Structure 1
Amino acid sequence: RVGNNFAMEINLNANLWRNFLYSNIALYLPDKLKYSPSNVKISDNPNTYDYMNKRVVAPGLVDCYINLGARWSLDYMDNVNPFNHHRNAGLRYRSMLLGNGRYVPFHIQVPQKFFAIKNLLLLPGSYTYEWNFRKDVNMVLQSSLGNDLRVDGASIKFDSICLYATFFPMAHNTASTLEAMLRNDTNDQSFNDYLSAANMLYPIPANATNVPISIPSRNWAAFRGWAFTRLKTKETPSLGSGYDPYYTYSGSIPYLDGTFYLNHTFKKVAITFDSSVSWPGNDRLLTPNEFEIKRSVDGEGYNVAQCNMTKDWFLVQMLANYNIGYQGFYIPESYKDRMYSFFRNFQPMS
């Protein structure tokens, strides 16, 4: 051989990066950015796997040169449920727990969650314990694509259900004594629900921007405060009934699981008592008449943390979650900054 050898070139790193973008982001892009393939039969049902699997997406949408040098989430993906993904470790693990096959005979142990009985110490006697179990695959099962399992052939059958109970082999004299004590009202057990709240859902029509809510005059003694988010109607099964005929989704259910992801869409909140009194009023906030969650360019000066969040809001969230705010801002102690906490989940971008 006279000269150099025959060689072919390839950009290993660029390739890998690309493959990652296409697989993890591109394909999850909203349907609106997609298009149907030519000469290929595709389902009419968008809630279908066939559909989601055939719609084609251009890699140029999320190519390796996308927002180069930045730490930015795609504006297209912000409102896309992040949990419905093949990279969801929790869901992945639960899937593997069952096996790698379609057909699965299962054996599980289900816990009692109801607050009034979950930790209750039951005295001697005979009790009637009865419960209802759902059969709806869109409810009992979860998918990463969130397709419609009813249409998609998923099936489930209950063969047998037993009730297990473990008992401390307590000394009889002792047990008997403990019983006597627990039988007096002064020694009555008591529990409270962890969430401790009345839950309400108010519709937000597509494109709506104003959401007014009214609560007819009532009693407020012991009121603790407010907590809120925003959910997609599609991802919220109807619970005012044993079965929801219009529920054609099997992804994460924020209302029940806590997979909240739409908090950045809030602009502001105005609270008013008796049609005239502004809470908290008292000239407390920078913009006293309401809670401003975020400002757009025009109000930069009132923003903080290098993002569009307001100083006011950052202050309230920090105090509410960790009592941090009047004596400086700092990273909260790890044990106070949990999974569903404010700070740990706060991500400012530019």
Structure 2
Amino acid sequence: RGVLDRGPTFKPYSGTAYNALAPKGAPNPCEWDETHVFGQAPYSGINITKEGIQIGVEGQTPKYADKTFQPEPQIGESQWYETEINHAAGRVLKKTTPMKPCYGSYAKPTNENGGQGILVKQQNGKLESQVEMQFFSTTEATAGNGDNLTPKVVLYSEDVDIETPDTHISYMPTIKEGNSRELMGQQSMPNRPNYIAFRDNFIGLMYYNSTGNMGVLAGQASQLNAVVDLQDRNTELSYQLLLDSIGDRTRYFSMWNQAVDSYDPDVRIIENHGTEDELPNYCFPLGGVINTETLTKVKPKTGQENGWEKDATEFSDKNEIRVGNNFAMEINLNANLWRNFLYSNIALYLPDKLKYSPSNVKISDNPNTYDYMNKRVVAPGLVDCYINLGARWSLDYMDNVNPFNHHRNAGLRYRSMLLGNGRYVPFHIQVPQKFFAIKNLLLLPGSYTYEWNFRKDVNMVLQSSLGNDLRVDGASIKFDSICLYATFFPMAHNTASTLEAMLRNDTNDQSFNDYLSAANMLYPIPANATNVPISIPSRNWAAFRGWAFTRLKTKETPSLGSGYDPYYTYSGSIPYLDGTFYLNHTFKKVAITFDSSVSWPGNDRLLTPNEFEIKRSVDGEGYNVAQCNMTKDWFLVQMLANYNIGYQGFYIPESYKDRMYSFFRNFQPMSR
């Protein structure tokens, strides 16, 4: 219960809602000083003399329109073609407003009308918008006392308090910030899309494997606990791995983010097979032809041969007709959008070091800050169409990066879009409790105690779709009164007092465990040290199910066991939480060994006797099986665990054996 604040850290949309159909590099009508260049005219008139426009003769009195609303961009003229207007009117923003591209321009309608005006005026009742009624004459009239210097355009200057939200410019010509002519090459680069809400199926909301303050369940008589966690234990990874069996974790539900963080198979693995552009498409000029030529009609009467005088009844001399073909400006549509999406989705979520540094614009301090990663734009060349066309192959270039922070996830996208698009929110939900001991328990009557805590840091509790911090940037969450919604069955009161007999005795006790009942261990591997093993002294371990290892980053998570940690400066996808074990292929060879003796597979069963080669590239075409880089030592191994394949031959699994977090779903072999 309470309120959430996202901050200036998020953008659920990738595009623009503010003049996003006008040209990218074209500035708004405004003036500069050293002489002016720009000015536009949409509105119509009859005859202007001492006032701004005369827009009508209404009845018996002429009317000139107010400064509040005057040239609405909506209204133009009934005709499409090149037609001439005697009296026109348009807005030309005042000299407090610099040259700024239309693509991404927000304005504040201060008055009753949507036509945005001034805020400050004189002392009595500051209301009237300082919109200039200064008309513009033509070169036709300059001299003569009494001669009409009648305006063709009347330009309307506005002093409006404005800010730019949806765009931040990539390339600017000169330093000048007040007024300058040299902001002509100034264009519009939209901000990087990223959305912030609950991590998939309420994960990371409460503490799991953190016993500074534990999830203790006691009793009004009972002194004991229900939480006994350690750093060498998993509870965050449980509620996804065991829940893989009970339906595919993709189905649409709003409470828990039941659709889980999942990359597009079209985006991560590139489907580069060119473009369908085999036909040219055309952007014909206004309606066909733009030319004015005198064309006078002709017909034979006296001149019998080739030479004739003129026509009988002559058509009017103004004939805007082409002698040849009507024009068409050629476009290849298929290739245009292909650059837009493929250059974007690869370069957007790439680590920023080769990316660009300050050029005539303001920039933030830290590399991991939202605004620092925002204004950076690498060249559309390597991330373009033509890297390796004709191969369903994600290159060595892309595969190292955080492949879950994307444009469309089943998880990431679903939460923020149903949370409340914006910072300040009054919203409530029933929130999780996921321990194995607590789950499917039917409590006996009596007197009990139930004690908990929360991880308060904004950074860890909520995800980011680009990989930008909340606590370090600007975000805070406040909590009100927390509740519990306990639901049980309305049992028959004769039975509710007698069915207890099973749990009334210490003979049969509701026993629970994780499917991954495992205990781990953390150890760091830095740069220029590719060979790191594990050494543990003599230990009395009895049972064992097997082994499962993958990779975690120190950059995107620290050695956690509390809320308050200054180490956590990221907010991206974590392998420990969302099942984001993306760097699984990063294993060359694995050799297991026991207590002071020779390494594990000594019972000689495979081509390589001791070391399990996970990856061997172009070493020998007979070690890496079925055109996949994996060696036979590990290729058979994956379908040998839960699957019963590798003795009866080779089987292709049914539509339920591949429970989403398993092998073929995730991984697909590739070649270039």
- Please indicate the TM-score interval, normalised by the length of the shorter structure: over 0.9
Report the counterpart of residue 260 of structure 1 in structure 2: 581
Report the counterpart of residue 343 of structure 1 in structure 2: 664
CA contact (8 A) 1:321 1:342 kept: no
Write the distance in 2 (CA, Å) between the matches of 1:58 and 1:326.
51
Write the distance in 1 (CA, Å) between the matches of 2:386 and 2:467.
30
TM-score by length of 2: 0.51
Write the distance in 2 (CA, Å) between the matches of 1:109 and 1:330.
44
Given the superposition, is the C-alpha separation of residues 100 and 112 from structure 1 closer, same or farther in structure 2, using an over 3 Å criterion? same
Report the counterpart of residue 653 of structure 2 in structure 1: 332
Report the counterpart of residue 201 of structure 1 in structure 2: 522
Spell out, residue by residue over 1:128-150, the C-alpha distance to the aligned partner (whole angstroms, 9 max, x if none).
Answer: 11111111111111110111111
Spell out, residue by residue over 1:153-188, the C-alpha distance to the aligned partner (whole angstroms, 9 max, x if none).
Answer: 122111221111112100011111111221111121
Query: Is residue 121 of structure 1 aligned with residue 442 of structure 2?
Result: yes
Spell out, residue by residue over 1:302-324, the C-alpha distance to the aligned partner (whole angstroms, 9 max, x if none).
Answer: 11121211112110111113121
Write the distance in 2 (CA, Å) between the matches of 1:70 and 1:17.
16
Q: How many residues align?
A: 350
CA contact (8 A) 1:26 1:61 kept: no
CA contact (8 A) 2:550 2:583 kept: yes
Shift of 1:37: 4.5
Picking from 175, 180, 185, the partner of 2:496 is: 175
CA contact (8 A) 1:295 1:308 kept: yes
CA contact (8 A) 2:623 2:631 kept: yes
Write the distance in 1 (CA, Å) between the matches of 2:495 and 2:638.
49
Spell out, residue by residue over 1:248-303, the C-alpha distance to the aligned partner (whole angstroms, 9 max, x if none).
Answer: 11112111221110011111111111222321211112111111101121233211
Spell out, residue by residue over 1:97-155, the C-alpha distance to the aligned partner (whole angstroms, 9 max, x if none).
Answer: 10212222221111210111111111101221111111111111111011111122122
Unaligned runs of 5+ in 1: none
Shift of 1:236: 2.0
CA contact (8 A) 1:305 1:348 kept: no
CA contact (8 A) 1:273 1:279 kept: yes
Spell out, residue by residue over 1:172-205, the C-alpha distance to the aligned partner (whole angstroms, 9 max, x if none).
Answer: 1111111122111112111112221002111101
Secondary structure in structure 2 of the residue aligned to 1:229? strand
Shift of 1:27: 2.1
Q: Which runs of 4+ in 1 moved over 3 A?
A: none
Residues 45-54 or 58-67, more deviating: 58-67
TM-score by length of 1: 0.96
CA contact (8 A) 1:83 1:259 kept: yes
Spell out, residue by residue over 1:209-234, the C-alpha distance to the aligned partner (whole angstroms, 9 max, x if none).
Answer: 10111121112311111110011111
Write the distance in 2 (CA, Å) between the matches of 1:51 and 1:248.
14
Write the distance in 1 (CA, Å) between the matches of 2:402 and 2:522.
19
Write the distance in 2 (CA, Å) between the matches of 1:27 and 1:188.
53
The structure in which a higher percent of residues are strand is 1
CA-based RMSD of the aligned residues comes to 1.4
Secondary structure in structure 2 of the residue aligned to 1:142? coil
CA contact (8 A) 1:321 1:341 kept: no
Among all aligned residue pairs of Structure 1 and Structure 2, give the percentage whose two residues are the same amino acid.
100
Secondary structure in structure 1 of the residue aligned to 2:576? helix
Secondary structure in structure 2 of the residue aligned to 1:30? coil
Write the distance in 2 (CA, Å) between the matches of 1:285 and 1:347.
24
Secondary structure in structure 1 of the residue aligned to 2:498? helix
Report the counterpart of residue 103 of structure 1 in structure 2: 424
CA contact (8 A) 2:639 2:646 kept: yes
Report the counterpart of residue 249 of structure 1 in structure 2: 570
Residues 278-287 or 238-247, more deviating: 238-247
Asked which structure has the greater RCO (Cα within 8 Å, sep 6+), the reply is 2
Secondary structure in structure 1 of the residue aligned to 2:468? coil
Report the counterpart of residue 555 of structure 2 in structure 1: 234
CA contact (8 A) 1:30 1:76 kept: no
CA contact (8 A) 2:370 2:468 kept: yes
Of the two, which has the highest radius of gyration?
A: 2
Write the distance in 2 (CA, Å) between the matches of 1:4 and 1:54.
46
Unaligned runs of 5+ in 2: 1-321
Spell out, residue by residue over 1:25-62, the C-alpha distance to the aligned partner (whole angstroms, 9 max, x if none).
Answer: 12223323312241112112111000110112111121
Query: Is residue 306 of structure 1 aligned with residue 630 of structure 2?
Result: no
CA contact (8 A) 2:617 2:624 kept: no
Query: Is residue 143 of structure 1 aligned with residue 464 of structure 2?
Result: yes
Write the distance in 1 (CA, Å) between the matches of 2:351 and 2:331.
31
CA contact (8 A) 1:235 1:254 kept: no
Residues 49-58 or 31-40, more deviating: 31-40
Residues 30-39 or 115-124, more deviating: 30-39
Report the counterpart of residue 86 of structure 1 in structure 2: 407
CA contact (8 A) 1:30 1:77 kept: no
Given the superposition, is the C-alpha separation of residues 242 and 152 from structure 1 closer, same or farther in structure 2, using an over 3 Å criterion? closer
CA contact (8 A) 1:229 1:262 kept: yes
Write the distance in 2 (CA, Å) between the matches of 1:305 and 1:219.
41
